[PDB]
Design a binder for this molecule. Sequence first.
Ligand SMILES: N[C@H]1[C@H](O)[C@H](O)C[C@@H]1C1CCCCC1
Length: 330
Amino acid sequence: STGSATTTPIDSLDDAYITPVQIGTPAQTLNLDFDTGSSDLWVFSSETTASEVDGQTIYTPSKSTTAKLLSGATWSISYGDGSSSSGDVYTDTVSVGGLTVTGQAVESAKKVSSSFTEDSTIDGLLGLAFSTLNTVSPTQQKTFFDNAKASLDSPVFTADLGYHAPGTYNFGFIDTTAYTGSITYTAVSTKQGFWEWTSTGYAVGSGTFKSTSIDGIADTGTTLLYLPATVVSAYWAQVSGAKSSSSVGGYVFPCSATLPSFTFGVGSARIVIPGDYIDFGPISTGSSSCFGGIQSSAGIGINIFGDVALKAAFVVFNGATTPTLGFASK
Ligand SMILES: N[C@H]1[C@H](O)[C@H](O)C[C@@H]1C1CCCCC1
């Protein structure tokens, strides 16, 4: 089997991407944030504290003839940005772009933090990291991909995020028309439950490539590119007036600036992030200070190849017995 679904930026900045997902019978379609950095499929629901729902589409398990309460199961997750959610668990039928999984754990939110409430465009998350990170207790549950894998033509999914444009998540096949040149594959460590890999280095604009190992995770659920302070300083040094602002919470730059590209290495291959991908707009409405798309990972504990990096590439998440990651230009 295969699946193919369009993923769409939630706003003009590509802050996140949502993908339609069919849950239950008859289908209830929710727009989920596909997150290769987490492993829970959770949704706004009929059970979510009413005051914490503001415009989201909700899953109503009582209206699904295939919904079954997973007795005694609870979940609770907190993400890297300080947001959180929790609730109970159903199993139900879940389909993404024509690919169907029966008995998928659908985690129903009873509580969500303010940042989820305040974002009307995201109805929940669909985790695509390794199932070892799943927070369901006392019986850990598998991700959608983990459940689908054996049925897929090939045990892979691909992320093809657009810049200011829709893109595609494919399951079970590699669309050879969706990228240029070749796909370069690179080793993955699953030790921390992430799609963790090691970049071979970087360049800033037309500058010389610096060969240096950068361990990080491929995370579709993170907006920005988070890299070591040395690398990030080298980047913003090429932008007149750019500086790190403690009050804003990262590097900012004059909105009048022309940003240089950023290149990262995948083995001997190179992925080039165009400068305008790195512009995340005025720090507040009307401001002439803009927020940078490359930020320091220093206070995180891990480097994160988020959407800013990933949307410059066609990315293969290879879920073979020994998982690997593939990157191609496009
Ligand atoms: N909505 C945020 C995304 O998640 C990125 O982290 C940056 C963006 C925003 C830009 C304006 C300054 C504050 C941060």
